[PDB]
Design a protein around this nucleic acid. Structure first.
Ligand SMILES: [K+]
Ligand SMILES: [K+]
Ligand SMILES: [Mg+2]
Ligand SMILES: [Mg+2]
Ligand SMILES: [Mg+2]
Ligand SMILES: [Mg+2]
Ligand SMILES: [Mg+2]
Ligand SMILES: [Mg+2]
Ligand SMILES: [Mg+2]
Ligand SMILES: [Zn+2]
Lengths: 82, 8, 130, 175, 101, 38, 46, 162, 222
RNA sequence: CCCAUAGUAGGCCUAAAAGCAGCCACCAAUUAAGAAAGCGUUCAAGCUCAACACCCACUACCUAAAAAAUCCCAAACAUAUAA
């Protein structure tokens, strides 16, 4: 009996408004602003698969953050049988 | 006063 | 035993050696508190109340920060770093805010640091605040 | 201690699963339902809201209601009702970076992100990760015509999936 | 932390840790503060106050503990290990607990 | 105590001790883990 | 190249030696010269 | 070395530690290249359980062994000295390194049996009721196998099983 | 700053379609009629077949001679298949199915009256033979545990090995022979009939060189 | 030894699946912590492990028993130059 409220299904509205951003009954839909009104870093975000260890720079925190996760993955693989 | 091969 | 070829410095150390330089060059207040074992919620909350006045909380390993200080001008800050050591670094001396936030926790010791290239004690800060 | 569960806005009920937990710990279920429904009166019903019920030693309860889950925000912005059954192979929804940016503004106010004083870029990077688990593809620009084409193809796929499920369910009946 | 917390701080009225951070003999005393100031140990008894005093007078570090019975324990950490101090602290906790009750 | 040719700790609270010339496994949390070298 | 350690809290007040020269230099100058210095100082500080 | 004194004055306990006189290693070791005290003085394979002058330097006041990290001994030599001290205690050669007894504890008299080269603890050993055939004889160990490499001045090697 | 190191990658590795060990039949599909002699030499001395790794990187190495009956194969199959990860691990048989017929006489009968009827089939194995070979996207530490469990339950001495550990084993034995300080070796004495020793030695000892006794392999013999 | 916050109860299926019945992905916040390696819960909670910090654990990475019938069964011995 419990579910989410009905979602929109209009391409025009779904591409011109952020439908679920406004959660209040008395509020209005949040209109999408023009491209010039959004920060530059938004459009440089990685929309694809995660960067691999080879792509990452060995002097960045991202490189060593990736190696630590891989070592944790290896530890879990080795521990499973142990 | 101990030589190279001195042993206590 | 023949010594072993010295292990080549890891790239993270270099990044840490560069971020320490930056924190130490581009900030003015550099307090040095002992990172006591407050709960995760409390540590996050006290770090949000300090960030209200944009007073950052750094944490650097004592095996990178010490070499740096040894070879740097801050050669008298070494004794402080015996144990867990967080840095409370702000870009403009906001001591009174830090001090009142730091006084909410009776057991968290403010050990000292260096404001405006002057190594102070705890009372130095409490005096610079007044 | 802390009781933490997702409770839909305005639809708190005395039934499971929160009710039994509250009763076992001594908190009155009816009182919470009234308080939660009253404090979530201005929010559209059915919105999943993560709740944090702080139970004090005398069994008086304080509730800490946060912003809706990111799963809702991404599903609502895509127009989809259910996520992908096999994310990475099937694209169940399509949203733009602008949608994610607008969601981050609301979700950045949640106490989890707000207390960390993280830049909005960090919240955007997190939302993109959650989208990659729901089957929703984030694209730099989406037109109304491109979204209609995808919706048309997605409807066909979903209809075929229903037929496949019916076949399995019908086969199970024959078993 | 865990070892001290298991015993608890029920008979300890106040714990005061006084050390000079710039001095070179405060490592043991500072380690003692970290253990007693842990959330677990502090949570055992909320009426006990852990007070950390930072001085730059150059005096040797000292730890003063006040129990509910009124007896006090003074531990001078200049030439004492953290483990030794914590062991003595725990023993006196046990002694003052049985006396009161 | 169960006699064992190979002594194995069955939980984190098991501790190995050599007493009266032979090895023992003692466990306060789960006394059933107690083992004697055979 | 190495800043001096912090003075003890109980030790008598100590002033850096580099300023000791500045303290003496001010006494030698004349009030008219100090006054002219001051007019430029007040404006420069604003 | 460092001592600790506990003094109760005016219903207050003061715990303090003082640094006492510390002995120094004799100068000019004959083998400076040595990596542990034993081989620095060319003592490897040349000491036994009865060399209390040597053994007593590596034990605590109550007869306990000292950590290997403190003494600097290697694992091999540290284990040899460890066994040698146990045999020295059992032989009665360390009468001033007895265990600490709490106040009010006077040990009850126990039969005096002179013994030496005792590998095991007397209480942990069972009688040899069945000796077994000559080709499978149950033997009584004497000494320690850790000392098997000690310098042998006789043509017969040390018998470790009697 | 705990120093992390690169994790090994198995991206090039490929898992066969049938990862698990196949079923081994008790007896050959066509039953053997001709009864065969005991031929105990088939488990004596060094193995010449299936001594090297083929597809996988891990295996169980035989350290003695023995016969594997169907009961052993079931223990190996069920233990390995239950313990292995089908997605990331694959296992192949490195031994043929039971093919050598073993005869038994009916209970209670005296000596004589001809040879007994065929009762069961066995697979002869020699020391040095790989018995099961495993591979896939895993490390030796992952499979060593359950492979060692299986090896312990075999009717001959056996040990789980890898490409690295197997090669190190062989290199160590070669080094021991090269640096051996004993001027007298079993090979030299036997091949020259020194002391007339060949009167107490088998012709096989000229090639076994004191490392094999019956079905038993002595790894510490040089 | 020490220590553990968080998008989030990822979606899917499911009466319920919340790291931990199954299927897919396995991205990301925080200096640091696996969309979870082992327990646990009807589902949750709850206890560990891999993280950070602290900091010289400065680990071995070879395994391991015993019982019979008249009564154990030489005595003994670790020390003087291989004969
Ligand atoms: K076996
Ligand atoms: K689940
Ligand atoms: Mg999570
Ligand atoms: Mg879910
Ligand atoms: Mg799940
Ligand atoms: Mg479960
Ligand atoms: Mg992370
Ligand atoms: Mg949990
Ligand atoms: Mg851990
Ligand atoms: Zn146990």
């Amino acid at each position: 009996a419990l579910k989410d409220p009905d979602v929109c299904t209009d391409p025009v509205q779904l591409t011109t408004y952020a439908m679920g951003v406004n959660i209040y009954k008395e509020g209005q839909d949040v209109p999408l602003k023009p491209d010039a009104e959004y920060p530059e870093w938004l459009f440089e975000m990685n929309l694809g698969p995660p960067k691999t260890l080879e792509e990452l720079d060995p002097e960045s925190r991202e490189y060593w953050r990736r190696l630590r996760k891989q070592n944790i993955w290896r530890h879990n693989r080795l521990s499973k049988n142990k | 006063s101990y030589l190279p091969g001195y042993v206590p | 035993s023949p010594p072993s070829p010295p292990q080549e410095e890891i790239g993270l150390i270099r990044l840490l050696r560069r971020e320490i330089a930056a924190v130490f060059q581009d900030n003015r207040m550099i307090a040095v508190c002992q990172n006591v074992a407050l709960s995760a919620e409390d540590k996050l909350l006290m770090r949000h109340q300090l960030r209200k006045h944009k007073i950052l909380m750094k944490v650097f390993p004592n095996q990178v920060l010490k070499p740096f200080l040894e070879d740097s001008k801050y050669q008298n800050l070494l004794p402080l770093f015996v144990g867990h050591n967080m840095l409370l670094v702000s870009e403009e001396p906001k001591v009174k805010e830090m001090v009142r936030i730091l006084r909410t926790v009776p057991f968290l010791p403010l050990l000292g640091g260096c404001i405006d290239d002057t190594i102070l004690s705890r009372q130095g800060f409490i005096n610079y605040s007044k | 201690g802390v009781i933490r569960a997702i409770v839909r806005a305005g639809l708190a009920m005395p039934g499971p699963p929160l009710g039994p937990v509250l009763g076992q710990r001594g908190v009155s279920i009816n009182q919470f339902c009234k308080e939660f429904n009253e404090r979530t009166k201005d929010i559209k019903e059915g919105i999943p809201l993560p709740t944090k019920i702080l139970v004090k030693p005398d069994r008086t309860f304080e509730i800490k209601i946060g912003q809706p889950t990111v799963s809702y925000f991404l599903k609502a912005a895509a127009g989809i009702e259910k996520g992908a059954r096999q994310t990475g192979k099937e694209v169940a929804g399509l949203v733009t970076l602008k949608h994610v940016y607008e969601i981050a503004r609301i979700k950045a106010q949640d106490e989890a992100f707000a207390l960390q004083d993280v830049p909005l870029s960090s919240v955007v990077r997190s939302i993109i990760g959650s989208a990659r688990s729901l089957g929703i593809r984030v694209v730099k620009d989406l037109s109304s015509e491109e979204l209609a084409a995808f919706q048309k193809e997605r409807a066909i796929f979903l209809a075929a999936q229903k037929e496949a499920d019916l076949a399995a369910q019908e086969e199970a009946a024959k078993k | 932390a865990a070892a001290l917390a298991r015993l608890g701080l029920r008979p300890v009225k106040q714990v005061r840790v006084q050390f000079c951070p710039f001095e070179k003999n405060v490592e043991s005393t500072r380690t003692f503060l970290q253990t007693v100031s842990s959330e677990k140990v502090r949570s055992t008894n909320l009426n006990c106050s852990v007070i950390a005093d930072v001085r730059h007078d150059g005096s040797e570090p000292c730890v003063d503990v006040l129990f509910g019975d009124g007896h006090r324990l003074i531990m001078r950490g200049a030439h004492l290990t953290a483990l030794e101090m914590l062991t003595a602290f725990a023993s006196h906790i046990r002694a003052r607990d049985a006396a009161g009750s | 105590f169960k006699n064992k040719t190979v002594l194995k700790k069955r939980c984190k609270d098991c501790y190995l001790v050599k007493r009266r010339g032979r090895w023992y496994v003692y466990c306060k949390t789960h006394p059933r883990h107690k083992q004697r070298q055979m | 190249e190495a800043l001096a350690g912090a003075p003890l809290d109980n030790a008598p007040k100590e002033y850096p030696p580099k300023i000791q020269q500045l303290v003496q230099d001010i006494a030698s100058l004349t009030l008219l010269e100090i006054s002219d210095l001051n007019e430029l100082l007040k404006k420069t500080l604003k | 070395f460092r001592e600790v004194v506990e003094t109760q004055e005016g219903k207050t306990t003061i715990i303090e530690g003082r640094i006492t006189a510390t002995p120094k290693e004799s100068p000019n070791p004959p083998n400076p290249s040595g990596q542990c005290p034993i081989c620095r003085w060319n003592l490897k394979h040349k000491y036994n359980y009865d060399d209390v002058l040597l053994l007593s330097q590596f034990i605590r006041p109550h007869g306990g062994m000292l950590p290997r990290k403190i003494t600097g001994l290697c694992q091999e030599e540290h284990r040899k000295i460890e066994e040698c001290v146990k045999m020295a205690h059992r032989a009665g050669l360390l009468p001033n390194h007895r265990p600490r007894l709490p106040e009010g504890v006077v040990p009850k008299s126990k039969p005096q049996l002179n013994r030496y080269l005792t590998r095991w603890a007397p209480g942990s050993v069972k009688p040899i009721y069945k000796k077994g055939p000559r080709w499978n004889r149950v033997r009584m160990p004497v000494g320690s196998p850790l000392l098997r490499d000690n310098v042998c001045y006789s043509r017969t090697p040390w018998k470790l099983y009697h | 700053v705990k120093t992390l190191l690169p994790v090994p990658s198995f991206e090039d590795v490929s898992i066969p379609e049938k990862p698990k060990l196949r079923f081994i039949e008790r007896a050959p599909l066509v039953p053997k009629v001709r009864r065969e002699p005991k031929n105990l030499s088939d488990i004596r001395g060094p193995s010449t077949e299936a001594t090297e790794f083929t597809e996988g990187n891990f295996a169980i190495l035989a350290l003695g001679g023995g016969y594997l009956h169907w009961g052993h194969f079931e223990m190996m199959r069920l233990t390995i298949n239950r313990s292995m990860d089908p997605k990331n691990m694959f296992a192949i048989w490195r031994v043929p199915a039971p093919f050598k017929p073993i005869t038994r006489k009916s209970v209670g009968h005296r000596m004589g009256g001809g040879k007994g009827a065929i009762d069961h089939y066995v697979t002869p194995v020699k020391a040095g033979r790989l018995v099961v070979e495993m591979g896939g996207r895993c490390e030796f530490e992952e499979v060593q545990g359950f492979l060692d469990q299986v090896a312990h339950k075999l009717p001959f001495a056996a040990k789980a090995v890898s490409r690295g550990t197997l090669e190190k084993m062989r290199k160590d034995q070669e080094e021991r022979e090269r640096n051996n300080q004993n001027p007298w070796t079993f090979e030299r004495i036997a091949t020259a009939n020194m002391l007339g020793i060949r009167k107490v030695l088998s012709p096989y000892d000229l090639t076994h060189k004191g490392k094999y006794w019956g079905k038993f392999y002595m790894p510490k013999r040089v």
